Design a protein around this ligand. Structure first.
Ligand SMILES: [Mg+2]
Ligand SMILES: [Mg+2]
Ligand SMILES: [Mg+2]
Length: 177
RNA sequence: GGAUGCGAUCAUACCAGCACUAACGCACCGGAUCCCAUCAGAACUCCGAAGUUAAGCGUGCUUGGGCGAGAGUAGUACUAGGAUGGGUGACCCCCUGGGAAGUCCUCGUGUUGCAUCCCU
């Protein structure tokens, strides 16, 4: 329904000129929180990869890409480049989610946690839906089990809403797995 | 199509080597009485028209040097503005903008005004 990160196809080109009346048309698949930020990052890469700045470029089309089957579970592989405190590195990550938007959200959260990498220090190189038999990370493999079975070792005790919250109770919580 | 006189632009026009040129020219060239000129008629000056296109001038050529233009170097280096951005610091990412320079590679090697004359 609502995602932190949205996937967009951005299409643009250099402004037509007398030497090139039909300049090459470039497309990118970019992740951003909305259309405005997707366009800005599109010109960032075109400026540094194709030497086409926004001042001498033309925005053609921008469309948001939605997950095809948002009700099933897919394995998503993400190839990314990120900047640490001392240089640049490449890494491959895998995630399980119903939509690639969720998998990308997990990637940003994980990078912030395990590496203290902020959002603007990450470039997504490639994304793909990996079949179960081609996954590489064990964090994803262990859930490829037809007889998946485990208990809830840690539960969160709380009333359904704060309406039923009281400071004092006559007895302690009764918990059992 | 060119030359000559005066030029403009001051190397795409310069430098080096090699090759070539009808006609009119431009030259080299002959002489030293006079003007003039020096150690020196070499130069300068004056007078001349036997000889020669050898040189100069002109044109062409060179996987030539230089010069000129493009491409590339490169959205790199650097830089204006922004952040209770990262980092111990040194420094650096990102955001709103601007944006170079050797090497290497390709191409080019003048254009043009007025007047007179030759090709006629
Ligand atoms: Mg003499
Ligand atoms: Mg000759
Ligand atoms: Mg040369």
């Amino acid at each position: 329904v609502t995602y932190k990160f949205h996937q967009y196809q951005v299409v643009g080109r250099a402004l037509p000129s007398e030497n090139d009346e039909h300049p090459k048309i470039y497309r990118m698949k970019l992740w951003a929180t909305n259309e405005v930020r997707a366009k800005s990052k599109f010109w960032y890469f075109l400026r540094k990869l194709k030497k086409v700045k926004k001042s001498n470029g033309q925005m053609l089309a921008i469309n948001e890409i939605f997950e095809k089957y948002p009700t099933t579970i897919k394995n998503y592989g993400i190839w990314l480049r990120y900047q640490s405190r001392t240089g640049y590195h490449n890494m491959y990550k895998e995630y399980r989610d119903t939509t690639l938007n969720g998998a990308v959200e997990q990637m940003y959260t994980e990078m912030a946690s395990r590496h203290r990498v902020r959002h603007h220090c990450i470039q997504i190189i490639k994304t793909a839906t990996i079949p179960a038999k081609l996954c590489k990370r064990e964090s994803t493999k262990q859930f490829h089990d037809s007889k998946i079975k485990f208990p809830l070792v840690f539960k969160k005790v709380r009333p359904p809403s704060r309406k039923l919250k009281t400071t004092y109770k006559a007895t302690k919580p009764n918990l059992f797995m």
